[PDB]
Amino acid sequence: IKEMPQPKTFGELKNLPLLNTDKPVQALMKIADELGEIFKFEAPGRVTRYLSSQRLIKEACDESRFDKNLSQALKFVRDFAGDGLFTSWTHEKNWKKAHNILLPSFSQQAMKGYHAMMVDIAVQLVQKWERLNADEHIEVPEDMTRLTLDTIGLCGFNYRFNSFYRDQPHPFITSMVRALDEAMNKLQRANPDDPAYDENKRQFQEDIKVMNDLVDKIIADRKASGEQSDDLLTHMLNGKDPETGEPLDDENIRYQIITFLIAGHETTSGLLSFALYFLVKNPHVLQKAAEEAARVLVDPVPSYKQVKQLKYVGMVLNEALRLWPTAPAFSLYAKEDTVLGGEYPLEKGDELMVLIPQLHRDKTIWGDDVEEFRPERFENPSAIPQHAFKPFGNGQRACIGQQFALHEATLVLGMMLKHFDFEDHTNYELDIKETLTLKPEGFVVKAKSKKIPL
């Protein structure tokens, strides 16, 4: 039985002021590097424990001992994502009901139906880059966020955000990005009751009303039309939970749509941005991925079956998720009193945070080359220890979007590698911006067209 370390304190604010930064996840990663596999983190009225080792996280991933907790970030996002899948407790009726209804919508089989809509947006990205003049560059996270937002609009509810036609965001996205900024900024606030936050609170309520009004209108407009498009909204309007026999109500459907728009905007765009960063910084890896793209993608438009054959591209995406898991943490609570790692007693209700980027740097798992970009690490999943790699979370509360995200990212990265050579023309220094998620900021490249027609 060991006493766990704790980072520096600020009197009655305890560790809270360590989060007073634009990069709190990266600050927690530096704390983990200093203090090791487990540390205590206290704020007024709250204690959690940050886990960084596979040794402890493999125990935390035991669903008999630990269930998903809503971190403060997820409790603040719940003010607009409601009892959608991502911000519901496992024990709320709407979690299992929506999980049962939506699982068939997110299977590998469902991806065959979403593929044509994903190709529509991927072709828009390739045509944009084909049309750049010689003196121009690509704003990588900007263009990847245009793509992933448009994909989930089209597969989610047959709506075109038309992100490649504008710089000014859609009114829904203005409100969603500002609501996510308020939720994440509110985490650090020592004095949230201070009148100085009255305007923030007014604006947040306005942004919730904008998101609710626009998504409620999408649902009402679909029910009125009777249109049976092959999208998540049709699946939610028609689907019945096998257990309860009940469908989702229109309020829960709205929360699921808001949740899918958050995910599409924030996550897959980060993965694609980090993958392109690592490829331009590792030219031998880029060459190997480009060779696979050329060998497999033999038609003007990729098919579902061709994307399934981009195995090395899939290993590139896993190695990008290893070094920079764009959704960088998840939270657990102890279902009963238990001992972690034979050393750290926990009481029922005690909270843990899994720091995914640190888990992914555990040298006892990956070896001394842990900071190197080596997709070949993922050749054989049986050679990877249990719970070493958790970019989609754990167990029944793992990401429902995992198949969707990896299909879109594999398709797009394969088309990018087929159609262009890339230059790191600025010798870009990685700068990671934190929203709900991690993304490179200011990452720019030049593309040189291979002049292969679509």
Ligand X SMILES: O=C(COc1ccc(OC(F)(F)F)cc1)N[C@@H](Cc1ccccc1)C(=O)O
Residue 392: active-site member: yes
Q: According to the annotation, is 50 in a ligand binding site?
A: yes
Cα–Cα–Cα angle for 185, 437, 359, rounded to 5 degrees: 115
The yes or no reply on residue 330 touching ligand HEM (CB under 6 A) is: yes
Q: What is the DSSP letter of 191?
A: -
Minimum CB separation of residue 16 from ligand X in Å reads 6
Q: According to the annotation, is 155 in a ligand binding site?
A: no
Nearest to 372 by CA among 319, 441, 318, 444: 319
- Judged by CB under 6 A, the residue of 29, 31, 41, 271 near ligand X is 41
Residue 157, Cβ density class (10 Å: 0-12 exposed, 13-18 middle, ≥19 buried): buried
Buried b (16+ CB within 10 A) or exposed e, 300-313: eebbbebbebbebb
From the list ligand X, ligand HEM, none, pick the one residue 43 interacts with, judged by a Cβ distance below 5 to 8 Å according to partner type. ligand X
- Concatenate the DSSP letters of all residues of 39-85 into one string: EEEEETTEEEEEE--HHHHHHHT-TTTEEEE--HHHHHHHHHHTTSG
Residue reference for tokens 């305890």:
14
Structure tokens at 326: 């764009």
Pair 407, 116: CB distance under 8 Å:
no
Pair 7, 39: CB distance under 8 Å:
yes
By Cβ distance, which residue is nearest to ligand HEM? 401
Site for ligand X in 155-194 (CB under 6 A): 187
Stretch binding ligand HEM (CB under 6 A), from 15-23, 31-39, 137-145, 391-399: 391-399
From the list ligand X, ligand HEM, none, pick the one residue 278 interacts with, judged by a Cβ distance below 5 to 8 Å according to partner type. none
Which listed residue (76, 204, 274, 392) is catalytic? 392
Site for ligand X in 327-366 (CB under 6 A): 327-329, 353
Pair 337, 366: CB distance under 8 Å:
no
Nearest to 405 by CA among 329, 337, 318: 318
Structure tokens at 415: 């088309």
Residues 260-299, mask of contacts with ligand HEM (x by CB under 6 A): x--xx--xx--x----------------------------
- Judged by CB under 6 A, the residue of 437, 443, 445, 446 near ligand X is 437
- Judged by CB under 6 A, the residue of 149, 258, 400, 415 near ligand HEM is 400
From the list ligand X, ligand HEM, none, pick the one residue 413 interacts with, judged by a Cβ distance below 5 to 8 Å according to partner type. none
Nearer Cβ to ligand HEM (172/446): 172
Nearer Cβ to ligand HEM (215/446): 215
SS3 of residue 136 by DSSP: coil
- Judged by CB under 6 A, the residue of 405, 411, 432, 447 near ligand HEM is 405
Site for ligand X in 313-332 (CB under 6 A): 327-329
Structure tokens at 350: 């005690």
- Judged by CB under 6 A, the residue of 85, 173, 313, 436 near ligand HEM is 85
Residue 364: active-site member: no
Stretch binding ligand HEM (CB under 6 A), from 38-46, 157-165, 245-253, 385-393: 385-393
Stretch binding ligand HEM (CB under 6 A), from 200-208, 216-224, 255-263, 303-311: 255-263
Taking each continuous run of H as one helix and of E as one strand, the counts in the chain are 17, 12
Minimum CB separation of residue 100 from ligand HEM in Å reads 11
Query: Dihedrals φ, ψ of 177, to 5°?
Result: -65, -40
Residue 326, Cβ density class (10 Å: 0-12 exposed, 13-18 middle, ≥19 buried): buried
Structure tokens at 75: 């409790």
Nearest to 147 by CA among 155, 12, 220, 234: 155
Nearer Cβ to ligand HEM (236/327): 327
Residue 155: active-site member: no
Residue 131, Cβ density class (10 Å: 0-12 exposed, 13-18 middle, ≥19 buried): exposed
Nearer Cβ to ligand X (299/347): 347
- Judged by CB under 6 A, the residue of 302, 357, 375, 391 near ligand HEM is 391
Which residue ranges are tagged as binding site for (9Z)-hexadecenoate?
A: 50
Q: Which residues are catalytic?
A: 267, 392, 399
Per CB under 6 A, residues contacting ligand X are 19, 25, 28, 41, 43, 46, 48, 71-73, 187, 327-329, 353, 436-437
Per CB under 6 A, residues contacting ligand HEM are 68, 85-86, 99, 152, 259-260, 263-264, 267-268, 271, 326-327, 330, 391-393, 397, 399-401, 404-405
Which residue ranges are tagged as binding site?
A: 50, 399
